[PDB]
C-alpha cells in the first residue's frame, strides 16, 4: 500500500508473501543502493515487503512484540513507527506502542551509510518500545543503537541497553572538521530506563552531538564513577562554541532525572546547555568542564543528589536561575542569580521518592514521582507552599522569566514548553523551575 506494513513478529529473511522488519529495512537499503543490479532486484519488492508509493515508512502494528535475533543495519533514510489510527483514541499515551525486543545478545540497529564524504541521512523512530538484551548483552558499543547518522527518537521507551560504551546509543562522528558524516541523536518525549555501560551509560558520543528534551531518565548506571550517562569524549575545536550554546541545540531540557547510579548525569562541555530539568535523588549530578565559558545551566532543580555538581579547576560554565546548593552556585550574573536551597528543607512530600503525595504536607517542594493516566511520562509535581502575598519566597514557582537579551542573560531564558508539552509562558510571563510548569 502507501507504507511498508510488517506482517509478522518473527525475524525472517525468507522470500515469501510475509514481510518482516528485517526485510522491510533491507528493501529500503537496496532501493537506495548504487549498484543498479541491486536496485533492479527490488524493483518489485523484496522477500514479501513492498509498497506502491515506494516511500521509506515502516509501519508496525499496535501492542505487538517484534523479535530480532540479531542487529539490523540501516543504510538508507527511513522511518519506523506504530500504526496511528485507533480504529476511540482515549487511552494512556505511550501504551499500544509496538515493541522491538532482542532475542539474543546483539544490539538492535546500526545506522551508517558505510561510506566517507556521503552526507548523513535522517532516521525517525516513533512510538516504539526498544528492549535490549540486558544482562545477556554481549554488545561492546551501543547496546541498543550504534549511530552514525542524524537520528530522531520520539514517544518511545528505551530499555535494556547494556554495553561497554553507550548503553542506549553510541553516537559516532566528529563535527569540528569539514566532515558532514557525523551522527546526531535527538530524543524527545521518551523514557530511558534500565540501561548500563562502563562509560556513557545512556549515550556515548565522541563529541557533544545529542539533545534530550521532554524525557524521563531513570534507573540508569555508568559503572565508572568518573564517567557520565550522557558522555562527550572530545570537545569542539573552538568551532564557535558560543554559537552552539545560544541556539540551545546540544544538551538536556525539560527532563526528569532521578534514581540513576554510578557516575555523573552528563559532562557539560562548551556548547552544551541545560534548561528546566529536575535532577534529584541521583548518585552524581553534573560534571562541569567548559573552559571557554560557552555553556549554560538554567531554570533547573539541581539538589537532592549525593554529589549535585563537580567541576574541573578551569571550568567557567554559567549557572543562572537554578535551585542549587552552595557548591553549584557559581554566582554568574548579578542580574540573573540562583536560588539557594535552604538547609533542612524537605524536598519530597512523601515517605518515598515515588508513590502517593502527602497533599496535606505544609512542607515539601515536590510530590513523589507519579505517572498520570493522561500521560506517558511521570514527573515530580511542584507544590505551592507559599501564600499569594509570599509567592516571591517560593523556591520553584514563578522564579524563571523570558529574557531575549542575546548575551549571558538570554542563556537563562525559560523553555517555551515543559515536559508535558504545556506552554510555560503562553498565558503568563514567568516560568517555574524544573521540568514541570505548576498547573495545580
Amino acid at each position: 500500500g502507501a507504507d511498508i506494513e510488517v506482517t509478522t513478529t518473527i525475524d525472517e529473511d525468507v522470500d515469501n508473501t510475509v514481510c518482516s522488519l528485517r526485510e522491510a529495512v533491507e528493501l529500503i537499503n537496496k532501493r537506495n543502493s548504487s549498484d543498479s543490479t541491486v536496485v533492479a532486484s527490488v524493483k518489485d519488492g523484496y522477500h514479501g515487503c513492498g509498497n506502491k508509493d515506494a516511500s521509506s515508512n515502516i509501519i508496525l502494528q499496535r501492542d505487538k512484540e517484534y523479535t530480532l535475533n540479531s542487529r539490523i543495519t540501516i543504510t538508507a533514510p527511513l522511518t519506523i513507527s506504530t500504526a496511528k489510527n485507533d480504529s476511540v483514541d482515549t487511552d494512556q499515551p505511550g501504551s499500544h506502542n509496538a515493541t522491538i525486543k532482542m532475542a539474543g545478545t546483539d544490539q538492535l540497529f546500526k545506522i551508517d551509510d558505510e561510506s566517507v564524504e556521503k552526507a548523513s541521512f535522517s532516521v525517525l523512530l516513533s512510538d516504539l518500545n526498544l528492549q535490549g538484551a540486558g544482562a545477556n548483552s554481549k554488545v561492546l558499543t551501543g547496546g541498543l543503537i550504534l549511530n552514525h547518522e542524524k537520528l530522531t527518537i520520539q514517544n518511545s521507551r528505551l530499555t535494556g541497553g547494556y554495553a561497554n560504551q553507550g548503553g542506549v546509543i553510541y553516537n559516532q562522528g566528529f563535527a569540528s572538521k569539514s566532515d558532514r558524516t557525523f551522527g546526531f541523536v535527538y530524543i524527545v518525549n521518551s523514557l530511558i530506563q534500565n540501561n548500563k555501560a562502563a562509560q556513557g551509560g545512556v549515550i556515548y558520543s565522541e563529541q557533544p552531538l545529542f539533545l534530550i528534551t521532554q524525557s524521563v531518565i531513570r534507573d540508569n548506571e555508568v559503572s565508572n564513577t568518573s564517567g557520565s550517562l550522557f558522555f562527550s569524549q572530545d570537545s569542539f575545536d573552538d568551532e564557535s562554541t558560543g554559537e552552539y550554546v545560544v541556539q540551545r541545540a546540544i544538551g538536556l531540557s525539560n527532563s526528569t532525572v532521578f534514581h540513576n547510579k554510578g557516575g555523573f548525569i552528563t559532562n557539560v562541555r562548551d556548547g552544551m546547555f541545560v534548561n528546566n530539568i529536575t535532577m534529584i535523588k541521583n548518585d552524581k549530578g553534573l560534571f562541569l568542564e567548559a573552559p571557554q565559558g560557552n555553556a549554560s545551566i538554567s531554570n533547573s532543580i539541581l539538589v537532592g543528589n549525593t554529589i549535585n555538581c563537580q567541576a574541573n579547576s578551569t571550568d567557567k560554565a554559567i549557572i543562572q536561575s537554578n535551585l542549587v546548593t552552595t557548591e553549584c552556585n557559581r554566582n554568574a550574573s548579578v542580574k540573573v542569580p540562583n536560588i539557594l536551597y535552604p538547609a533542612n528543607q524537605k524536598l519530597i512530600a512523601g515517605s518515598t521518592d515515588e508513590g502517593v503525595c502527602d497533599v496535606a504536607s505544609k512542607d515539601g517542594l515536590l510530590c513523589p514521582f507519579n505517572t498520570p493516566k493522561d500521560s506517558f511520562l511521570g514527573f515530580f509535581k511542584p507544590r505551592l507552599l507559599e501564600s499569594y502575598n509570599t509567592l516571591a519566597d517560593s523556591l520553584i514557582i514563578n522564579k524563571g522569566r523570558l529574557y531575549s537579551d542575546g548575551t549571558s542573560v538570554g542563556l537563562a531564558s525559560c523553555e517555551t514548553l515543559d515536559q508535558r508539552g504545556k506552554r510555560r509562558t503562553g498565558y503568563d510571563e514567568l516560568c517555574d523551575l524544573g521540568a514541570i510548569e505548576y498547573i495545580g
Binding site: 542524524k150 557525523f182 535527538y186 541556539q247
Partner: peptide, 14 residues
C-alpha cells in the same frame, strides 16, 4: 541552523 537541514531535527539544531 547548526548541523544542517533535517526533516525531523528541531530548527535550532538544523
Amino acid at each position: 541552523k547548526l548541523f544542517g537541514p533535517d526533516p525531523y531535527l528541531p530548527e535550532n539544531v538544523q
